[PDB]
Design a protein around this ligand. Structure first.
Ligand SMILES: *[C@@H]1O[C@H](CO)[C@@H](O)[C@H](O)[C@H]1NC(C)=O
Length: 361
């Protein structure tokens, strides 16, 4: 099994216990650690944070302890406009400039591969993503001639049917990618005007236009489009999503006024880290969606959809039953990486829960 774990470069800026540098990572936890995100400047891959060169080195020194650990660098992400990637991918010259820049930058910085995180291609971009993936792979195949183990190529793909169909030729790109991380944790958000879970495994039995808004629908869909099970990796979040309730109602369909209040450490409305959620659960009311197989909690006017040890184990069992390639975690810095917040004295409780299932059976 693969256990693909993202680390985000902006987590370093969080206050006090929220600050996470790559030497916080247990080297034997994940099989692959992906640093998010690189820029594209001068149509070449490049650093984003001022100190990225140092943080790359800190990450890549984990391989002193575990020489089998694979690292990748993710290019793109949501602070990179889709329209920027489009411009690069859609022209022969800029695409070649970009492609050629990748392997030397990866080798300089000690990475084993590239993750493409174009978030997200429009309908005019589908064919250009295909070309990008094929040509990038062929550049990696050429570069392996020089004697170092071929660089890996992955991509992060959204899990909504509409986004998939719009932007991705799954049958084609799956040929050239080493794995696809399916982002099975964005099925609900505050644009909905009601509470709801963003990472359910299955449909809620109560309401149903969108039988597509769940992990199982998306996994099935990808396999049906021709993504091989042995290249497909299912996304599992360590964060939760928060909402401000508009009324005293908390159950299916409860109305909301907006996203939840920022977390003390992550400081972004509508999201909480797992460590923040463990604190949140003191004084909260806990509920599980029985059919969706995920939990939610509420206190005051706040309502949080999240994943816990049980729900992530349940997802790991699912993907193993489907003979997928493994799990992807978004993100290490959003798990209880200190291990001091969730009553367990155990660093990375969610990631470790997953790992233990995958290793078993
Ligand atoms: C990313 O690259 C673009 C294009 O050169 C540049 O305008 C921008 O400043 C870069 N962002 C960062 C954070 O380096």
């Amino acid at each position: 099994y693969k256990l693909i774990c993202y680390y985000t470069s902006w987590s370093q800026y969080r206050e006090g216990d929220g600050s996470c540098f790559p030497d916080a990572i247990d080297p034997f936890l994940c099989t692959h650690v992906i640093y998010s995100f690189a820029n594209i400047s001068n149509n070449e891959i490049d650093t984003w944070e001022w100190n990225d060169v140092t943080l790359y080195d800190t990450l890549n020194t984990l391989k002193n302890r575990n020489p089998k650990l694979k690292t990748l660098l993710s290019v793109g992400g949501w602070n990179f406009g889709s329209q920027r990637f489009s411009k690069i991918a859609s022209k022969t010259q800029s695409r070649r400039t970009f492609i050629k820049s990748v392997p030397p930058f990866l080798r300089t910085h000690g990475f084993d591969g590239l993750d493409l995180a174009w978030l997200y291609p429009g309908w005019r971009d589908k064919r250009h993503l295909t070309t990008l993936v094929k040509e990038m792979k062929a550049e990696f195949v050429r570069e392996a001639q020089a004697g170092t183990e071929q660089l890996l190529l992955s991509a992060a793909v959204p899990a909504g049917k509409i986004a998939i169909d719009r932007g991705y030729d799954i049958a084609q790109i799956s040929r050239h990618l080493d794995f696809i991380s399916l982002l099975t944790y964005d099925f609900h958000g505050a644009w909905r005007q009601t509470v709801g879970h963003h990472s359910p495994l299955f449909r809620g039995q109560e309401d149903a236009s969108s039988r597509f808004s769940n992990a199982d629908y998306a996994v099935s869909y990808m396999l049906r489009l021709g993504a091989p099970a042995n290249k497909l990796v299912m996304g599992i979040p360590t964060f939760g999503k928060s909402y401000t309730l508009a009324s005293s109602k908390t159950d299916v369909g409860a109305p909301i006024s907006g996203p939840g209040i920022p977390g003390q450490f992550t400081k972004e409305k509508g999201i909480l880290a797992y460590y923040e959620i463990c604190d949140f659960l003191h004084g909260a009311t806990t509920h599980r969606f029985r059919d969706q197989q995920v939990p939610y909690a509420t206190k005051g006017n706040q309502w949080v959809a999240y994943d816990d040890q049980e729900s992530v184990k349940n997802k790991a069992r699912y993907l193993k039953n489907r003979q997928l390639a493994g799990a992807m975690v978004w993100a290490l810095d959003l798990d209880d990486f200190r291990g001091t917040f969730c009553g367990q004295n155990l660093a990375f409780p969610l990631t470790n829960a997953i790992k233990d299932v995958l290793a078993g059976v």
